[PDB]
Amino acid sequence: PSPYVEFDRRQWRALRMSTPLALTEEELVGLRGLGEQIDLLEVEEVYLPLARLIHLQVAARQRLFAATAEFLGEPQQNPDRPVPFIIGVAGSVAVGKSTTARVLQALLARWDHHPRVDLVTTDGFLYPNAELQRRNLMHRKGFPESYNRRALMRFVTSVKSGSDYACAPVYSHLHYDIIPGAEQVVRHPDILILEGLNVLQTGPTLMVSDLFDFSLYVDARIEDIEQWYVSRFLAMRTTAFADPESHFHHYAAFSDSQAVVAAREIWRTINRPNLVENILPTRPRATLVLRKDADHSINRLRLRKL
Amino acid sequence: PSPYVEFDRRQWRALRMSTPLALTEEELVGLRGLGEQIDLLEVEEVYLPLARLIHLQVAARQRLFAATAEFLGEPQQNPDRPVPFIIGVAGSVAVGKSTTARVLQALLARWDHHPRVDLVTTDGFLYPNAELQRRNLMHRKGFPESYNRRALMRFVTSVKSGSDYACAPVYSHLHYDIIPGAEQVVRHPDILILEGLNVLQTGPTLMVSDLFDFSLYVDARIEDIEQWYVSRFLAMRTTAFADPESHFHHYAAFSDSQAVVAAREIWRTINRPNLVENILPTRPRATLVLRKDADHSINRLRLRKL
Ligand SMILES: N#Cc1ccc(-c2ccc(OCC(=O)O)cc2CN2CCN(c3ccccn3)CC2)cc1
Ligand SMILES: N#Cc1ccc(-c2ccc(OCC(=O)O)cc2CN2CCN(c3ccccn3)CC2)cc1
């Protein structure tokens, strides 16, 4: 006996679930352009059933807010509306957290109950490169210490406080660094999805995940993720690395053969270690685990028993 | 702003409650049954509203369980009832956790939604004294390493998994040790309260607090708790120390001045620093912080915004 219900892909299909609520095919157009390669059978069969499920919990939280407010007899100090409902998404680099997030943000916003869904990445809570160097941390971008954990805690606290706005820094993926003076403003949305490698990580402190209301871990075999990371690296020669402005411009010129070697090395020495030591252990802390096959389709869902 | 709504004693009392919540006959009589001078006015005016508030959360989760199972068209692999709803109670030694937990267990059981409330203390997961000496830990009883954290985790997991039964060892407070062979057997209660020093503690592992649905931290000025620790020691000359079988019998004969010195020293060297290092830092992880006045009465409630 486990604290999770487990459904393989066959079983999850083989239900028997409530709504049509099916997708408008004007919305399926908007859904294609959240690149990389968005499978639409994935959305219909997995992410929409998932979104409905999460809506159940967001709705339950909303009613419970109201029932409690009513029991307390709407006192001054009680807030007027439920505080944002925060979802965490965790997983290895290159597992597709970002895609998973953008898809859930688009689906969950379809309900009248909670139409304002914000998405923030913890990438903005990285120390700037300058500070990273200063701490011997350039080879460890994405490990726990490479984030300003205090600032990140302040951000989420403030959001969960129900404050009017909350500012986050913005990480530029092209420049591989924080953007000086850039800020993402967050104004008490109904849901906030928080995406990052570190969002389910433990701490002697209070940690951000104490402020979640739901969390996903996006899981895959480690071999499989390596393969995605390599294919991604080679593809970046055309785009990120192509700009002569990039610090990683010199990778643009590597042949396929040599780029594979370079990818696999960066994998082995930064991300794979980060995954095993720090990311994988936070997996059993997620409300829902999604295991993806080698070709990106979800082959197993684990869901905490309610 | 803050993620807690805050009421003090007056505000909480003076509130327009949406029910005539009065305790019955019969209710007060059975509550005198725990009545190590339990203040029944506090029980009616503070604990009962609090119990009602926790009830709302239990009933919301119970219905979510139902909405969710209905949505998945109740699959064979889905459980047939909500798993137990688990409540942590933490705080300093001699802060009154155990009283607070027993009172809550009595008040929560009165709803038909969940008449079966169990109570377990993490005291039962301490290593036996013989294992403690073996580890140079006799002087750190109640520090985190003094518990079999693995067995404790297995216990809470098993209950949150929905097992028919789960066992926990049993601690004799008068003999200061585990009772060999004793077991407390928990059988899918509707609600399980888990009381202890360490219940809200962090670990790199999946920790027990990951399995709670709600948690209490019982708070007080550190000075006050010392005063109560000292008084309780003096009072113990008459109860626990009075037995000449006891390992601490010799304390029964110490007079007020010496007993104060002895008590104050034990506090300064074991309990106080356990509180500062390991217990105080978990306080912000709780859903509800109850803070008691020098005279044991609750004077502030901080509740997490919904
Ligand atoms: N020293 C050193 C030193 C030198 C070079 C690199 C390096 C070069 C090219 C890369 O292109 C492939 C890609 O970008 O996938 C990737 C990396 C390493 N990654 C940087 C982004 N990191 C994170 C992690 C979390 C959030 C944002 N960013 C995770 C690790 C790394 C370290
Ligand atoms: N070495 C040593 C060594 C020797 C003696 C004592 C000792 C003697 C008499 C005491 O009587 C006063 C009282 O009982 O309040 C209290 C203690 C210390 N406390 C024992 C209970 N401990 C815990 C903690 C969690 C759960 C249960 N128990 C917390 C620390 C302590 C350490």
Swiss-Prot record, chains A, B:
Binding-site residues for ATP, renumbered to this chain: 91-98
The UniProt record lists the keyword Cytoplasm: yes
CDD domains linked: PanK
One GO biological process term: coenzyme A biosynthetic process
Subcellular location: Cytoplasm
Gene assigned in the entry: coaA
Miscellaneous comment as given in the Swiss-Prot or TrEMBL entry: Was identified as a high-confidence drug target.
Annotated organism of origin: Mycobacterium tuberculosis (strain ATCC 25618 / H37Rv)
Name of this protein: Pantothenate kinase
Keyword terms, alphabetized: ATP-binding, Coenzyme A biosynthesis, Cytoplasm, Kinase, Nucleotide-binding, Transferase
Keyword ATP-binding among record annotations: yes
The enzyme's E.C. designation: 2.7.1.33
Family: Belongs to the prokaryotic pantothenate kinase family.
Pathway terms, separated by semicolons: Cofactor biosynthesis; coenzyme A biosynthesis; CoA from (R)-pantothenate: step 1/5
Cellular component per GO, a single term: cytoplasm
Phylogenetic lineage: Bacteria, Bacillati, Actinomycetota, Actinomycetes, Mycobacteriales
Main EC class the enzyme belongs to: transferase
Gene3D superfamilies: P-loop containing nucleotide triphosphate hydrolases
Molecular function terms from GO: ATP binding; pantothenate kinase activity
Reactions performed catalytically: (R)-pantothenate + ATP = (R)-4'-phosphopantothenate + ADP + H(+)
